Amino acid sequence: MAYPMQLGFQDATSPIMEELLHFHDHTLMIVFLISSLVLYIISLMLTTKLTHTSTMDAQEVETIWTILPAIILILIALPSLRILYMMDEINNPSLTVKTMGHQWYWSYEYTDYEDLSFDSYMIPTSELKPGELRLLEVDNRVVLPMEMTIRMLVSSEDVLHSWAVPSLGLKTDAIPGRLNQTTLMSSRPGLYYGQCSEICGSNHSFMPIVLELVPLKYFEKWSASML
Amino acid sequence: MFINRWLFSTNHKDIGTLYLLFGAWAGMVGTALSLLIRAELGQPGTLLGDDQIYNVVVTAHAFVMIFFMVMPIMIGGFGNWLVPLMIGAPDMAFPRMNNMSFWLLPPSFLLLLASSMVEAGAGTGWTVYPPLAGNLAHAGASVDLTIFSLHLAGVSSILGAINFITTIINMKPPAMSQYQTPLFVWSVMITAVLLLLSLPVLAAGITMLLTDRNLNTTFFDPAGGGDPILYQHLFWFFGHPEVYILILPGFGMISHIVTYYSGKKEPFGYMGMVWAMMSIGFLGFIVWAHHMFTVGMDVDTRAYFTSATMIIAIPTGVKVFSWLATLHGGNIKWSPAMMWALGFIFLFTVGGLTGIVLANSSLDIVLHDTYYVVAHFHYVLSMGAVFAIMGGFVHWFPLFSGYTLNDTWAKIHFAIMFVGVNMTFFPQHFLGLSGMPRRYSDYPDAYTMWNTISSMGSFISLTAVMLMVFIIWEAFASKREVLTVDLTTTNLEWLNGCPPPYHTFEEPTYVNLK
Amino acid sequence: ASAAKGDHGGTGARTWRFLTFGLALPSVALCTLNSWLHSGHRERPAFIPYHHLRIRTKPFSWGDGNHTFFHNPRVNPLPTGYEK
Amino acid sequence: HQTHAYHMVNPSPWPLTGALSALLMTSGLTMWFHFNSMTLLMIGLTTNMLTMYQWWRDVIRESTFQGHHTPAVQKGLRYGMILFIISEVLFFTGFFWAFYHSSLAPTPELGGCWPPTGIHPLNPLEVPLLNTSVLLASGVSITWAHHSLMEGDRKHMLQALFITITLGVYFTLLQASEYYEAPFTISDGVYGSTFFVATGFHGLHVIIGSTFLIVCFFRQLKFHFTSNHHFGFEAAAWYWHFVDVVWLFLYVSIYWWGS
Amino acid sequence: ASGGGVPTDEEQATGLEREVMLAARKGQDPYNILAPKATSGTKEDPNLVPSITNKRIVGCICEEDNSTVIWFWLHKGEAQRCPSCGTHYKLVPHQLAH
Amino acid sequence: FENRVAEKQKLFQEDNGLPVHLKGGATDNILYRVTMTLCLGGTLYSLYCLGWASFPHK
Amino acid sequence: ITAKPAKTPTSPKEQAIGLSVTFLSFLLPAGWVLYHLDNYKKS
Amino acid sequence: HYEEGPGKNIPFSVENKWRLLAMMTLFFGSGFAAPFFIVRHQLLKK
Amino acid sequence: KIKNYQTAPFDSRFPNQNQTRNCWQNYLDFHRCEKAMTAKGGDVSVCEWYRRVYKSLCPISWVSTWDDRRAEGTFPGKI
Ligand SMILES: CCCCCCCCCCCCCCCCCC(=O)OC[C@H](COP(=O)([O-])OCC(O)COP(=O)([O-])OC[C@@H](COC(=O)CCCCCCCCCCCCCCCCC)OC(=O)CCCCCCCCCCCCCCCCC)OC(=O)CCCCCCCCCCCCCCCCC
Ligand SMILES: CCCCCCCCCCCCCCCCCC(=O)OCC(COC(=O)CCCCCCCCCCCCCCCCC)OC(=O)CCCCCCCCCCCCCCCCC
Ligand code: HEA
Ligand code: HEA
Ligand SMILES: CCCCC/C=C\C/C=C\C/C=C\C/C=C\CCCC(=O)O[C@H](COC(=O)CCCCCCCCCCCCCCCCC)COP(=O)(O)OCCN
Ligand SMILES: CCCCCC/C=C\CCCCCCCCCC(=O)O[C@H](COC(=O)CCCCCCCCCCCCCCC)COP(=O)(O)OC[C@@H](O)CO
Ligand SMILES: CCCCCC/C=C\CCCCCCCCCC(=O)O[C@H](COC(=O)CCCCCCCCCCCCCCC)COP(=O)(O)OC[C@@H](O)CO
Ligand SMILES: CCCCCC/C=C\CCCCCCCCCC(=O)O[C@H](COC(=O)CCCCCCCCCCCCCCC)COP(=O)(O)OC[C@@H](O)CO
Ligand SMILES: CCCCCCCCCCO[C@H]1O[C@H](CO)[C@@H](O[C@H]2O[C@H](CO)[C@@H](O)[C@H](O)[C@@H]2O)[C@H](O)[C@H]1O
Ligand SMILES: CCCCCCCCCCO[C@H]1O[C@H](CO)[C@@H](O[C@H]2O[C@H](CO)[C@@H](O)[C@H](O)[C@@H]2O)[C@H](O)[C@H]1O
Ligand SMILES: C[C@H](CCC(=O)O)[C@H]1CC[C@H]2[C@@H]3[C@H](O)C[C@@H]4C[C@H](O)CC[C@]4(C)[C@H]3C[C@H](O)[C@]12C
Ligand SMILES: C[C@H](CCC(=O)O)[C@H]1CC[C@H]2[C@@H]3[C@H](O)C[C@@H]4C[C@H](O)CC[C@]4(C)[C@H]3C[C@H](O)[C@]12C
Ligand code: CUA
Ligand SMILES: [Cu+2]
Ligand SMILES: [Mg+2]
Ligand code: NA
Ligand SMILES: [O-]
Ligand SMILES: [Zn+2]
């Protein structure tokens, strides 16, 4: 989750999101190199009574400042596309959990072995236990075994939603009659929070997502208690 | 006379003046919505107590500001005034069809305002994606009225695009090559061509949406074998070219302003600036699905769409560096317009860079539908499109009106406007990384400080808008008439005096073939 | 291809007039021979109430708002099967 | 007094009556779809016809009678009309995209196959082949009308232009027939949707074209067109090839391949 | 397959379209449909600029392929010069339309 | 039929200072007022209609 | 650019007025609505 | 014919600078008010 | 006979993010199998894999609906 006065990305919970942090660092570093440079050359251009209003040859400098940006772009593209093709992969996962968007809640379906399905609604604000976070807590969390490659299949039963967990670097749009797949791999236990990321109507702000990542042992027992 | 002059105009100048009044008005509508967005978000809790209304206000805000403020002022307003004057044409190719381009917009606008009045309004976001936008989650006439509002604006812009092209292609001096027309005209011809190819697919897209909602087609409804994704492809096929349509006339005006206020006879690298605007125009048509990086298209398609989006940086860069090069060794006049132009150059670049961050389908996973995307586009639109509009306006106001603005007041107006937009939009960068979604009427407590600061910024920008009005008033109140204008040798538009006569180039320019 | 003919000599309308009566219309009449001779009310299809056809997400703005605009009772059933 | 060859146009109300009629028609459709009433749509369609009439009336008045259509003004109208056809090409391109989108990747709901489980499609070698031969034939017959007009042959210009309109009208009845006789509807999922929205917009263009030609016919009856100046006829011939050509793609894409 | 009945521009052309068509025969351009051919633009051989008042906006493409046109008003009287390359232009006023 | 273009030419080129949309007699005036009347009628009626649809009915 | 003097000069006091009127025309009607929200939310 | 020059090529009189302020104030005024009154309108239906 | 199921394995036929069709295919392959065995003296035992994979990937509401339609006879798939 986000803390007060946060500037950057949520602390990474998965190796994908680690790679995005480092990649974001790479890219933002270049973005600083260039925004600084333009600012400097503007102030350079505007601070000298020296004039030269006659014509200037165009076809010479225009090489420097077409080629350099293209070499700079490849320096961005390569790492970017590596991380993309990594996000797909032959992953071969232990477990497959479906999520279904509704106006306005998520339902989860663990159907590998038994027909385990539950609704996961936002705790209202008036009903919060002391220390429980406004707009983020759910009645029934998504319990998942840690350090396991899980398959998430996202869909909707009404309109577009979008299943996001920044902490894990997951955003997959929920589309009716479509089964979108994303893989999940929490490197640690914990609670890890997300919110609908497509405008689904009146209550788009208020259908959040909580991952409770415990170990396999405690997952098995939870599954059987939710049937 | 009032009627024959102002309802039946066949005069590019008068029609231009009509467009400027439309945009200025619509602009106030657009602005008030923008404050209603930030008042709701300015503290934790729900202010309107009805989130469906918040979604309507957001949706209206983007339609108004895109189609009824930025597009009319730049293409309708500056375009009709200047294009004919800059190429020594007595009017536009179709002076009467041109009047219909203008008169379609009031009704177009009425229909949008109407959509928010009836039922619970179109709380869809300006993308209008089904099924939310469909006849089940948005039953009633709100969305249908939004669709028609768009149809009318669409036809209007298509008819104007035909006019600008035809005018620019066919009504130059016979001696005059295309490679001899100023950069602003180029910019409008390439914007005209974008409108021509893009707006017809929008019309197709939102018709198929109309018929889903009213004629029991299933273009987009999986029940009959439809696909919500078909719509996003069609929408965004137009959608991306539209963002370029919105900035391209801005590049024209800056090119002109930066050149004029440097006391150059011409912008650095003129053929480069053409090549760049044709390049942007062209790459703008092959990049659209960077808007669809989370819908579950192939990793290969996502790789392509990433790699293709990145190349736009090259041509766009040529322009940034050509402007800085135009400044080089200038006799700089620190006019208000020049500050607007310099403000743009830097603030557009920042906005252009956050766009390059978003280009990565890997990172766009974590950034899509967050305030990073809002931050990116408010930089290139509120500090890009709007800074070019302001610059253009203060620079050419005396050509239109025959009166001068108070430079000191205009300089104050820039300084207030510059602080506001930056305190408003910069922090939203953090909101994005920190994972605050778009289209939220309320936020986890953590997000409070930046929303509080962002919203205060909005109120500053408003004191700038209210002042600009007064400034326009003071110029008309005081009536200081233009005598003299520098650099008419290389700015034909000024050459007929301020303001120019009803009919200019009764007798065309004399230009030698040599 | 070139098609298997000639002219290009004295380009009259005469040539296009010759192509209109000499190929264009005869072709129309052959396709008309073929067409008004294959025609014969396709023994109508059988009604299975599939959920991906006879869609009704909002009543049409005419009739009972359940009949399409060129409704042929003989080949187009309503969502509840064929009429009298 | 002007010493350019461009047309400064008389203050005209028709741009306004055009915009207002555009409001009445959109408001009318809304009133019709949502609050079952045509009154407005009725009003809208009238002010639109009236506007279109008087607007194009003034253009003929301006050109045939006042002679403002110099070689320069003429050029402009060519560009204008090509640019206009181009916007239509992109407009149809939406409906082809939609068809190709759905036909190349049929969903589970359709039986994961094209054409969908339960659609008894039309045969392309029956009337659709007729429709094609009729429009292709009208492409020859108009081309003959055009050559007759430049060789200064009145009788044959008209004769050839009549055949054209007749073939164009023939098409329209055949299509109206096919529509009625078709065992599927616009309501029959994405097949119905892609089929009737596309062919329907194309059919709508065939009527605008037939109308345009009929306008050029009566103009010719009254001797408006010269041997060497007849832009209204040129544009109509251009627009007729557009309509003919859009038909071929519909025939090859929707009727043949997607069957 | 031969017979008349279609008017010619010669017969039926009218107004400004007619007058352009008549001027074009006599090799004239009273409506500036054609780029005028430059003289050497010396003081003795100045570019004759027809006008129908006592001033006309002259545009000068001083050197070929130059993207920027130099514009200035040419007034009746002693031949004025391009401010940029100094080629000469002189207003030969009037008639053009009787 | 008879070519009468050159007659229509001389009516429409007459220097009587009417705009082109009125230059062809009183019929133009009539047709032009019918158009404008219907437009402004329908536009008034449509705003009214819009007034009705902006408030709800049970 | 150079102009002739103001044909109808706007005095410092005339500007205080115009600015005040201008500022108030955006604020009062907005403020009236914004101020009375509680009584719309619960009608 | 139509009048030309400063304060004449516009659909509004700038003859009186206070009538002008009155005009300008209703124009931008009504524009900036509209959304507030729409929002109200939507709150008061329900 | 080649069991120990945890979840559906990766499938080279359905390699992208869209698995709509992987659900679809494995559902038919099942009810196609299941029909072929019962109606020609055999056992449904061999069709088990296809049921596991469709149960894993397919939303309950999708299977629920398709089952209701096979019953109704309005199932658009060739079984
Ligand atoms: C310089 C520029 C110039 C521009 C020029 C522009 C002008 C355009 C015109 C010129 C263009 C030329 C193009 C080349 C020709 C193309 C040929 C073609 O495709 O037609 C095949 C097509 C094949 O026939 P078919 O109907 O499919 O037969 C199979 C059945 O459907 C089977 O169905 P079933 O199995 O369900 O049926 C069961 C059975 C029931 O079982 C029973 O119980 C048996 C019942 C017995 C039925 C009795 C039938 C008797 C009919 C025979 C008549 C023969 C003599 C008639 C003579 C009369 C003369 C007026 O029914 C039957 O018996 C079926 C009988 C079928 C026999 C075929 C019918 C005869 C047609 C032959 C005409 C070919 C002429 C070509 C054109 C030449 C003119 C220049 O031919 C035609 O039917 C007509 C073609 C006419 C030419 C059209 C040209 C223009 C339009 C087409 C252009 C191509 C498409 C464009 C897009 C492509 C993009 C790449
Ligand atoms: C208004 C709120 C200000 C917030 C203050 C931050 C508090 C610090 C806590 C005290 C700090 C505590 C340290 C905690 C470590 C956090 C690590 C992390 O994960 O941190 C992640 C951070 C890393 O970013 C930073 O490292 C912050 C950079 C801030 C830039 C300074 C600009 C200040 C503008 C002034 C205010 C607005 C008015 C003018 C705006 C002018 C526009 C630039 O998040 C980002 O990725 C920011 C993305 C910004 C993208 C925009 C790029 C273009 C901007 C223009 C550059 C011009 C260069 C010349 C420099 C020229 C100087 C102008
Ligand atoms: C005028 C408006 C405008 C302009 C010009 C742009 C320009 C760009 N935009 Fe943006 N954009 C929007 C308006 C605009 N955009 C809007 C409104 C949305 C949201 C749509 C919605 O959801 O509502 C959006 C969304 C958007 C997304 C989707 C994010 C998401 O939904 O998840 C992406 C992804 O690539 C993107 C990228 C870019 C890029 C690469 C450019 C490039 O054109 C920028 C090029 C400019 C520069 C790069 C700076 C100048 C160049 C240099 C200094 C050269 C050197 C630089 C380098 C080598 C890096 N934009
Ligand atoms: C040109 C486009 C444009 C402009 C100018 C603006 C202006 C502003 N916008 Fe908007 N905005 C969008 C385009 C624009 N916006 C789009 C496309 C979206 C996404 C919509 C969606 O989610 O569906 C959006 C969404 C959006 C959101 C997100 C809502 C949400 O997702 O929850 C927010 C939040 O702060 C916001 C804020 C602002 C603010 C504070 C201003 C202003 O205060 C900035 C200051 C600028 C001005 C006030 C303009 C001044 C100029 C004039 C008044 C014209 C003058 C005329 C003449 C002189 C002739 N905008
Ligand atoms: C005979 C050949 C000529 C075809 C045209 C004839 C009549 C209709 C008129 C014009 C059509 C205009 C646009 C296309 C829109 C809709 C599709 C119409 C195609 C059609 O005609 O489809 C019919 C249904 O039409 C229906 O519902 C009719 C619904 C009537 C409402 C009109 C359409 C409403 C949508 C208008 C949107 C306009 C947007 C354009 C904006 C301008 C561009 C920017 C098919 O009949 P069916 O019984 O379902 O199947 C046959 C079964 N035996
Ligand atoms: C749901 C319903 C939605 C409704 C939306 C429709 C909106 C409005 C409909 C009312 C408009 C109809 C009135 C006719 C318009 C006539 C335009 C015309 O004919 O324009 C001509 C030029 O364009 C040319 O040729 C080339 C351009 C010709 C185009 C003709 C007009 C097109 C109108 C419809 C465009 C739809 C866009 C299609 C693509 C999506 C003439 O231009 P003028 O400046 O007049 O003359 C100048 C003089 O030199 C002539 O002597
Ligand atoms: C000038 C041409 C330049 C050459 C570039 C070539 C590009 C495009 C044309 C090729 C179209 C065939 C597509 C072949 C490859 C994809 C096949 C396919 O089937 O694509 C389909 C979509 O294509 C569709 O209709 C797509 C429909 C077309 C949309 C493409 C955008 C272009 C439109 C603008 C053209 C305007 C120019 C005017 C033309 C006269 C469906 O998507 P899939 O991903 O299959 O969904 C199922 C997945 O689960 C499988 O993994
Ligand atoms: C049931 C029906 C309802 C449907 C609504 C639409 C209705 C009707 C549309 C029919 C179109 C008829 C067009 C009439 C045009 C007449 C004007 C004309 O023909 O004008 C000509 C110029 O062309 C010009 O402006 C060019 C004029 C441009 C014409 C283009 C018109 C296209 C219409 C498309 C509009 C709809 C698009 C689709 C929207 C869904 C005149 O110059 P010339 O011919 O050289 O003559 C001069 C000589 O006499 C002297 O030597
Ligand atoms: C961009 C160009 C496109 C512009 C928009 C096109 C306009 C389409 C108009 C369609 O009008 C139809 O609607 C009527 C609906 O009332 C129908 O009659 C119906 O009305 C009767 C009277 O209530 C009913 O009883 C009957 O069902 C009857 O079919 C009738 O077929 C027809 O007039
Ligand atoms: C983002 C746009 C908004 C910008 C912020 C607005 C700044 C202040 C604008 C002033 O407008 C309000 O001020 C009064 C409160 O100070 C209100 O008094 C109301 O309440 C008073 C009691 O406080 C009564 O005296 C009055 O009768 C009256 O109804 C009044 O209605 C309202 O116009
Ligand atoms: C040749 C052409 C125009 C010259 C003219 O005829 O006046 C010029 C205009 C802009 C030029 C391009 C731009 O300067 C940007 C590029 C600069 C690189 O150094 C070469 C390729 C590059 C892509 C240039 C190639 C070529 O010289 C262009 C395309
Ligand atoms: C009216 C005119 C007479 C010759 C002339 O006007 O100079 C003639 C010449 C060509 C004639 C047309 C052509 O012969 C083509 C058609 C022939 C059919 O008899 C139907 C009428 C038809 C559409 C004719 C109408 C009319 O009689 C036309 C137009
Ligand atoms: Cu569900 Cu937003
Ligand atoms: Cu884009
Ligand atoms: Mg999104
Ligand atoms: Na809030
Ligand atoms: O011709
Ligand atoms: Zn010179």
Side-chain angles (χ1 to χ4, degrees), chain D residues 149 152 154 220 223-228, chain E residues 5-12, chain F residues 3 5:
Chain D
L149 178 58
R154 177 171 167 86
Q220 168 66 329
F223 294 72
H224 287 204
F225 300 126
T226 75
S227 67
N228 211 260
Chain E
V6 180
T8 63
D9 295 331
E10 180 47 35
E11 279 136 47
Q12 183 156 292
Chain F
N3 177 317
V5 175

Side-chain angles (χ1 to χ4, degrees), chain A residues 102 104 106 160-161 196-200 204 207:
Chain A
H102 319 268
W104 294 262
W106 298 89
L160 299 194
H161 308 263
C196 196
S197 304
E198 208 83 34
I199 199 166
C200 44
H204 163 45
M207 49 178 287

Side-chain angles (χ1 to χ4, degrees), chain B residues 4-5 7-10 90-100 103-105 107-108 110-111 118-119 139-141 144-145 148-149 151-152 158-159 161-163 165-166 169-172 196-198 200-201 203-205 207-208 210-219 222-227 229-230 233-234 237 288 502-508, chain D residues 1-4 6-20 22-23 25-27 29-30 32-35 51 54-55 58-59 62 71-81 83-95 97-99 101-102 105-107 109-110 114 116 186-195 197-198 201:
Chain B
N4 283 328
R5 176 147 194 182
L7 273 58
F8 311 170
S9 194
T10 61
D91 209 85
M92 302 287 293
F94 317 118
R96 169 182 45 208
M97 190 178 66
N98 200 36
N99 206 41
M100 187 161 66
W103 275 109
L104 277 162
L105 284 191
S108 180
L110 183 60
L111 286 166
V118 310
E119 302 289 355
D144 292 318
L145 287 189
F148 290 131
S149 159
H151 268 145
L152 294 199
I158 289 163
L159 293 179
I162 299 181
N163 225 332
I165 292 154
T166 302
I169 292 292
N170 187 57
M171 303 185 63
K172 310 172 302 311
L196 197 57
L197 303 169
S198 56
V201 186
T207 297
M208 289 181 280
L210 190 69
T211 67
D212 268 32
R213 283 175 52 81
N214 301 286
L215 297 182
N216 286 313
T217 66
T218 59
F219 285 111
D227 191 3
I229 297 318
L230 181 55
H233 281 303
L234 291 161
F237 187 75
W288 70 92
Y502 199 70
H503 292 301
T504 35
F505 310 99
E506 279 261 19
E507 165 168 48
Chain D
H1 201 267
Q2 60 159 81
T3 59
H4 58 79
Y6 292 109
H7 182 200
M8 306 289 85
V9 181
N10 288 188
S12 195
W14 309 138
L16 176 44
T17 60
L20 286 190
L23 179 51
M25 280 186 293
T26 51
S27 291
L29 283 179
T30 313
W32 184 46
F33 286 137
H34 283 290
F35 307 111
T51 280
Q54 299 180 101
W55 190 326
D58 299 358
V59 183
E62 282 166 0
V73 165
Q74 220 176 304
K75 277 271 219 174
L77 292 168
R78 289 172 180 274
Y79 298 125
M81 184 74 202
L83 292 165
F84 172 73
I85 279 160
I86 287 188
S87 73
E88 299 260 55
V89 170
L90 272 301
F91 179 64
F92 278 100
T93 295
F95 301 115
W97 193 337
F99 165 78
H101 185 79
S102 296
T107 35
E109 242 65 349
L110 298 177
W114 198 269
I186 190 172
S187 71
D188 288 344
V190 73
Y191 192 90
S193 300
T194 61
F195 182 88
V197 146
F201 265 116

Side-chain angles (χ1 to χ4, degrees), chain B residues 29-91:
Chain B
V29 176
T31 305
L33 287 175
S34 86
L35 296 170
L36 277 171
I37 293 173
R38 286 252 55 94
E40 167 58 64
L41 291 174
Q43 80 169 20
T46 187
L47 183 81
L48 303 164
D50 197 343
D51 268 37
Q52 171 61 8
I53 298 173
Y54 174 77
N55 292 342
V56 163
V57 164
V58 166
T59 313
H61 166 66
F63 279 121
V64 166
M65 286 300 224
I66 289 173
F67 291 92
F68 301 124
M69 192 269 280
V70 173
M71 267 163 93
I73 293 168
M74 279 191 202
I75 315 155
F78 289 105
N80 275 302
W81 260 102
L82 296 168
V83 166
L85 292 185
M86 270 165 198
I87 73 172
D91 209 85

Side-chain angles (χ1 to χ4, degrees), chain D residues 149-165:
Chain D
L149 178 58
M150 287 184 293
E151 287 174 47
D153 195 301
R154 177 171 167 86
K155 203 185 60 176
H156 285 147
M157 198 290 203
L158 287 141
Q159 203 199 133
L161 174 50
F162 165 82
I163 293 160
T164 318
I165 290 155

